[PDB]
Amino acid sequence: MLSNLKTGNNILGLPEFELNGCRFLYKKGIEKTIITFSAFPPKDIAQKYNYIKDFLSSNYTFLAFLDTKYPEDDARGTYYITNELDNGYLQTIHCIIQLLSNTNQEDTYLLGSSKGGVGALLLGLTYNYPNIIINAPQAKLADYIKTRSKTILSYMLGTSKRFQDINYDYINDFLLSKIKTCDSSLKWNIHITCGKDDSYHLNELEILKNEFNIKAITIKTKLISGGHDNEAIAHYREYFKTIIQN
Amino acid sequence: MLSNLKTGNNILGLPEFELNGCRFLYKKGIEKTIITFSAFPPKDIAQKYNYIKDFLSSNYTFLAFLDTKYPEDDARGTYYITNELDNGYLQTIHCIIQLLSNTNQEDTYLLGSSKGGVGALLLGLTYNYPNIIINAPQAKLADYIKTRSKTILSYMLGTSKRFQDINYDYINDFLLSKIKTCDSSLKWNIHITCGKDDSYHLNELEILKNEFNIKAITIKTKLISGGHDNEAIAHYREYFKTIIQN
Amino acid sequence: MLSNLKTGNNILGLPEFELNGCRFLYKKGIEKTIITFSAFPPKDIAQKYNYIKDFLSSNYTFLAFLDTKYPEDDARGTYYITNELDNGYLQTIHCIIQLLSNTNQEDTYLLGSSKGGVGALLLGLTYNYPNIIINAPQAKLADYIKTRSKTILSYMLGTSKRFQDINYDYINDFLLSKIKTCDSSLKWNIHITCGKDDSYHLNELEILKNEFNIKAITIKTKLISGGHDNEAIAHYREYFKTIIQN
Amino acid sequence: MLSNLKTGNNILGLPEFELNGCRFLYKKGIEKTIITFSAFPPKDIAQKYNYIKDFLSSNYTFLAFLDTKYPEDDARGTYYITNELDNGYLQTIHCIIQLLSNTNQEDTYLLGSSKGGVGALLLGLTYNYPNIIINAPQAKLADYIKTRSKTILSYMLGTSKRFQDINYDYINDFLLSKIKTCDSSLKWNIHITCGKDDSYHLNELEILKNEFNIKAITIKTKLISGGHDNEAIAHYREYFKTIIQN
Numbered sequence: 001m002l003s004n005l006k007t008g009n010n011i012l013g014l015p016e017f018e019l020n021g022c023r024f025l026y027k028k029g030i031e032k033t034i035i036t037f038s039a040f041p042p043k044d045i046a047q048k049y050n051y052i053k054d055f056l057s058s059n060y061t062f063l064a065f066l067d068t069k070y071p072e073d074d075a076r077g078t079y080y081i082t083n084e085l086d087n088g089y090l091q092t093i094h095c096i097i098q099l100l101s102n103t104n105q106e107d108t109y110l111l112g113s114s115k116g117g118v119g120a121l122l123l124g125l126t127y128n129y130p131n132i133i134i135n136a137p138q139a140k141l142a143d144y145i146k147t148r149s150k151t152i153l154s155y156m157l158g159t160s161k162r163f164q165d166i167n168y169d170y171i172n173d174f175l176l177s178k179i180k181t182c183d184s185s186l187k188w189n190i191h192i193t194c195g196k197d198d199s200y201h202l203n204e205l206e207i208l209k210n211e212f213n214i215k216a217i218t219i220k221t222k223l224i225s226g227g228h229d230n231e232a233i234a235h236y237r238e239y240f241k242t243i244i245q246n
Numbered sequence: 247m248l249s250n251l252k253t254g255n256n257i258l259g260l261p262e263f264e265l266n267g268c269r270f271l272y273k274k275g276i277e278k279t280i281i282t283f284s285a286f287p288p289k290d291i292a293q294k295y296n297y298i299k300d301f302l303s304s305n306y307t308f309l310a311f312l313d314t315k316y317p318e319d320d321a322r323g324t325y326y327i328t329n330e331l332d333n334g335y336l337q338t339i340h341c342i343i344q345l346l347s348n349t350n351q352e353d354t355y356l357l358g359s360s361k362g363g364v365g366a367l368l369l370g371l372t373y374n375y376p377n378i379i380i381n382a383p384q385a386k387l388a389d390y391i392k393t394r395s396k397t398i399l400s401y402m403l404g405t406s407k408r409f410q411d412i413n414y415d416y417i418n419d420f421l422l423s424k425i426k427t428c429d430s431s432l433k434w435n436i437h438i439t440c441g442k443d444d445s446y447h448l449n450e451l452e453i454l455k456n457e458f459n460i461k462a463i464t465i466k467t468k469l470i471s472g473g474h475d476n477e478a479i480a481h482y483r484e485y486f487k488t489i490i491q492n
Numbered sequence: 493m494l495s496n497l498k499t500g501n502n503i504l505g506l507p508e509f510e511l512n513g514c515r516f517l518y519k520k521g522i523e524k525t526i527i528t529f530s531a532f533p534p535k536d537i538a539q540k541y542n543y544i545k546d547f548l549s550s551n552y553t554f555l556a557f558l559d560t561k562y563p564e565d566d567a568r569g570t571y572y573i574t575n576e577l578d579n580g581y582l583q584t585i586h587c588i589i590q591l592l593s594n595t596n597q598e599d600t601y602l603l604g605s606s607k608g609g610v611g612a613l614l615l616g617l618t619y620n621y622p623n624i625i626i627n628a629p630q631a632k633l634a635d636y637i638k639t640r641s642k643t644i645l646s647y648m649l650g651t652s653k654r655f656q657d658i659n660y661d662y663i664n665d666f667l668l669s670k671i672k673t674c675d676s677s678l679k680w681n682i683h684i685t686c687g688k689d690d691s692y693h694l695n696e697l698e699i700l701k702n703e704f705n706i707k708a709i710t711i712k713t714k715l716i717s718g719g720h721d722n723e724a725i726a727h728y729r730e731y732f733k734t735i736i737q738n
Numbered sequence: 739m740l741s742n743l744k745t746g747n748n749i750l751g752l753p754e755f756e757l758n759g760c761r762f763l764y765k766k767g768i769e770k771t772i773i774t775f776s777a778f779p780p781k782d783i784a785q786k787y788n789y790i791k792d793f794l795s796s797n798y799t800f801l802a803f804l805d806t807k808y809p810e811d812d813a814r815g816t817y818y819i820t821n822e823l824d825n826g827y828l829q830t831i832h833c834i835i836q837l838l839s840n841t842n843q844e845d846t847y848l849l850g851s852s853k854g855g856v857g858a859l860l861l862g863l864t865y866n867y868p869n870i871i872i873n874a875p876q877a878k879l880a881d882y883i884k885t886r887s888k889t890i891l892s893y894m895l896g897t898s899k900r901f902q903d904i905n906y907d908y909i910n911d912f913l914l915s916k917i918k919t920c921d922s923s924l925k926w927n928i929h930i931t932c933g934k935d936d937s938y939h940l941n942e943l944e945i946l947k948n949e950f951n952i953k954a955i956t957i958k959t960k961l962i963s964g965g966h967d968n969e970a971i972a973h974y975r976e977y978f979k980t981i982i983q984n
């Protein structure tokens with residue numbers, strides 16, 4: 001029962017739930033369903049739910065998800081991938097949305113920036129959520145984790161020295177594989193913004209663009225002001241409300 | 247959205263849903279949640295939901311589950327174990343129950359006979375459902391599947407000659423392993439009936455009892471009229487109605 | 493080199509060869525290629541090549557094959573199935589035909605009676621040899637091996653008590669599976685005679701007929717005089733020469 | 739029929755054939771049979787036949803082989819091992835050579851470098867080809883495949899998490915196992931060159947030499963100019979022309 005999944009935490013008035021290690025906020029509304037994904041916080045700062053305030057007065061249905069809770073000594077998430085390096089966590093998220101949401105797929109919108117934007121792509125490409133509006137995702141996931149936490153990278157590569165390189169390449173390509181194996185017949189509605197000064201992630205977008213191109217899937221991109229920073233996020237927020245409100 | 251998970255089928259007035267390959271009936275009720283698992287049908291017979299008629303006038307919340315849909319050429323289920331021999335299917339069942347149920351865990355009851363009883367144990371021991379009331383479950387799963395479908399066993403064993411023995415043992419001990427790793431401190435309320443002329447499953451019950459014994463779990467057992475047959479099932483139905491109504 | 497594969501045996505003037513445990517006779521001719529398969533000899537009698545005399549004065553290309561050489565204490569063959577219970581032996585036979593024969597598939601004819609007829613079906617259904625003209629094959633291969641040699645059956649089921657039943661069913665169905673998985677688009681030219689007094693194999697033919705029927709493949713059958721005996725073989729020989737000469 | 743196995747391709751005037759997934763060039767000659775195996779090409783480059791130009795004016799019998807055609811998304815071969823990690827592909831190569839060659843075994847020469855040299859050893863040690871003259875083969879096969887294609891290694895490891903380690907060791911030791919089980923009494927004539935600056939494969943050669951040593955097999959070795967590169971290959975070509983012409 002939903003009320004028995006509560007953790008005792010409360011974010012801006014919304015009670016937190018947890019199911020199968022997956023923490024989420026939920027507010028039931030009407031007309032549309034809004035889904036958001038957490039990005040990396042600073043070291044020793046708790047993972048944060050995204051874009052609550054944007055939809056506090058919206059009265060749409062709202063779900064916000066965090067990343068995984070391991071490794072315990074730097075618990076900032078493993079890019080929505082299980083410690084078995086499989087889809088178990090995304091499967092849990094999909095079940096929560098499908099059973100708690102009161103709109104259909106075409107009226108559901110997936111949001112997130114950076115790691116949060118990768119999480120939106122991972123879920124939406126696996127389970128055919130067509131509306132994905134994100135900012136500055138990575139393409140090569142292991143390369144980026146390496147720059148943010150050596151502790152998380154070494155946890156995900158595992159203790160066997162022989163499979164560390166193998167696991168690194170598998171993680172690096174986990175998002176690119178989802179594009180390679182997604183359903184080309186769906187009427188995808190994918191939007192990807194990126195700061196014009198975000199030279200690293202501008203190149204990452206070119207990698208994603210190429211993978212969609214050889215799949216004959218058309219996406220929308222938009223250059224916004226800023227780097228990989230709060231200035232870009234401020235414009236990305238402005239961008240997704242105008243797309244959603246129209 | 248739950249209403250969009252409808253398959254189109256109806257069973258004795260209840261609509262059928264499907265989520266992540268998991269087919270189920272659901273009717274919202276009050277006071278108690280009743281969960282049932284399907285057993286093996288005869289060859290070329292469709293998988294059936296169990297004990298619907300027992301709870302139509304009860305107005306309890308009622309959820310009934312089928313086994314997996316593969317192998318396609320004998321689609322009678324893989325003992326609620328994924329083709330990867332892992333917990334992915336049980337995980338989906340757990341999500342469905344936790345979000346759709348409107349009662350506490352201690353007011354939830356898991357029912358099933360033979361393979362259905364094994365499914366009830368696998369879920370209950372993995373995710374801490376204390377009330378498990380079942381009839382004549384197996385202990386050695388691969389030994390029994392062997393007698394019902396060579397096709398299904400071969401599918402679960404896989405195609406590699408070198409891994410036949412290893413996977414036979416892994417499947418055979420899958421439920422015993424769940425007992426060995428369950429939480430000894432939960433207030434388990436496990437009831438297992440078995441027909442007095444069901445010699446095979448009387449011996450399976452002793453194998454199960456020994457695993458519970460060494461985990462400091464005492465269960466209740468009762469011999470009823472019949473073999474491994476409809477007579478025993480008739481008396482098992484009378485039994486769980488009594489326990490639930492007291 | 494072909495001449496270096498000789499064994500030293502010589503059958504009616506034809507030197508015997510062996511490649512990868514596969515013994516064969518070969519005579520190069522023109523126009524058509526004739527392939528024959530050995531059936532079970534009596535206990536302690538050597539495996540025999542079939543229908544040499546029929547094509548001694550024919551001047552067609554001719555290949556005659558024996559079954560496998562194991563088990564050593566009753567080496568009458570394992571139905572052209574390896575002791576790994578796979579296609580390794582048929583693969584060797586196919587290579588020999590493809591490299592030594594000087595006609596194409598449509599001008600090649602596969603012949604055999606009883607176990608020899610099963611061998612023709614096994615090879616022709618795996619590798620798309622359309623012309624298969626045989627007498628009184630079995631459908632349930634393990635049931636029949638049991639009646640001819642307990643030593644061969646126990647060798648093929650293997651020493652592990654747990655996999656004996658599993659292997660028995662797999663062998664029993666090895667031919668039926670080839671029909672289930674063969675290419676329905678080929679212009680099959682399959683002829684199956686059977687003695688009118690051969691009540692056991694008349695029923696086996698009904699089993700094969702049904703499996704071809706659900707595959708939408710049409711075959712030809714013909715009742716001949718005799719049981720499962722030399723009278724039937726004499727008429728079967730008369731039958732295949734008239735089909736081949738026209 | 740051999741002429742019906744033509745693929746349509748021609749390489750420097752020689753027609754390409756295919757039998758049971760095994761692609762090969764064949765030109766009938768006299769006096770000696772020369773066999774070559776293909777090494778790994780660079781990524782996105784087609785597999786190439788080796789050392790054609792070396793034997794065009796020689797009028798020897800010449801057979802050149804490619805590796806397997808899978809995995810389709812990096813089709814550079816699986817080290818002449820089947821997707822079942824067994825001898826089925828080597829068995830096809832053996833049949834082709836034994837039936838098409840017009841010379842004795844002791845007048846047959848197996849050639850190849852790096853992965854091609856491993857293929858020459860796998861065939862020669864399995865089926866008693868005494869003349870093996872190769873350059874810089876690997877000893878630990880999975881360790882090296884790891885550095886050339888994660889895609890190919892993952893395909894050979896399979897999909898089961900529980901069998902990753904087991905299959906890594908099985909592939910890694912596949913050639914060492916052939917040495918351990920080969921016939922010590924054959925009059926082996928094995929020559930292995932290696933560039934003097936190819937430190938990695940100098941160490942691999944010592945691992946191989948130790949397995950031969952304990953089987954009482956003495957081999958000839960020679961250091962040549964170069965690393966693991968075209969310089970070494972140029973000097974290896976000069977080397978095998980010398981040995982074959984004396």
Ligand SMILES: [Cl-]
Binds near residue numbers: 039040
């Ligand atoms: Cl991030």
Ligand SMILES: [Cl-]
Binds near residue numbers: 359
């Ligand atoms: Cl059952």
Ligand SMILES: [Cl-]
Binds near residue numbers: 532
């Ligand atoms: Cl026979």
Ligand SMILES: [Cl-]
Binds near residue numbers: 777778851852853854
């Ligand atoms: Cl190579």
